[model samples]
Target: AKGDPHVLLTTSAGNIELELDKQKAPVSVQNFVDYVNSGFYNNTTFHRVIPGFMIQGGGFTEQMQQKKPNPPIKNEADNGLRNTRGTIAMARTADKDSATSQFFINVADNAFLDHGQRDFGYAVFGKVVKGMDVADKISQVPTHDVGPYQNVPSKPVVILSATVLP
Candidate 1:
């Protein structure tokens, strides 16, 4: 809620340096920290992958089981952050304020997702300071439908651990 927070997400793909924009996205960043500190993202898999779009994860297991997430955070789409390439954002349902622990990383410039006429767009809370390659690699994996979920990775891309970069 003050200075930017850096987090390391060690995944099966690789380690990623995630930098949260706490100044503008305090609520989102704090919510994310709570999950990481609670070991909520351990063994979670990137359940959704869409090339040139975004790779979503942080709320589901390798077996496609949805991990129960904390209560929805307030929609921080109004934050000045843009949903550009290498940026991470909170993924929500049709309801603008429905985001929990699920998140996505933009592989391409997706300014369209920025808040405004986009109908209160997703919250852009973090950006990849390192390991953009890892994010891209995860995004490039083969995907298939699993039950009600589409774009699920054929081989699980598990997040071994999510920790604050002390």
Candidate 2:
């Protein structure tokens, strides 16, 4: 990445700006930059919301269809970043390096998600530089299980567009 990359995520609720740090977590940041540049997040929904935890999205459409994401990136949880409130991190499965386009914003201080001496944790690549109130609001939405997925917002919170801002 050349300059410090920032993205403006315009959602149905509101807009959130994220400043990614390539210097710290290059692979993860580049992956997010690629997604933003390619307009992959347009029309996506914040499908998962767990108040007091995080709000996750960037891979599912408003219809609850999961989009195919790019290949997983390297696990950068050891980048020395903490998963504190307002921080954005990759959403992975049990496999630490399985994160692709899905990501989440920490609504609370989640120190347990940070990399420890032995545990592989979620990579915190950026933080919400603006519109965290929007994230906070999204966290409070009514959610329920709709099949295999849980914590789905009853009313979809869509990501109208994601643009890379200079």
Alpha-carbon TM-score of each model against the true structure:
0.96, 0.96
Give candidate 1 misplaced runs (Cα > 4 Å). Answer: 1-3
Residues 32-149 of candidate 1: C-alpha lDDT, one tens digit per residue: 9999999999999999998898999998898998988889989999977888999999999999889999999999998888888748998998899999999999999999999999
Cα lDDT of all candidates, in order?
Answer: 0.91, 0.91
Clashing pairs in 2: none
Error of 1 at 95 (Å): 0.8
Can you give the lDDT of residue 4 in candidate 1? Answer: 78
Clashes of each: 0, 0
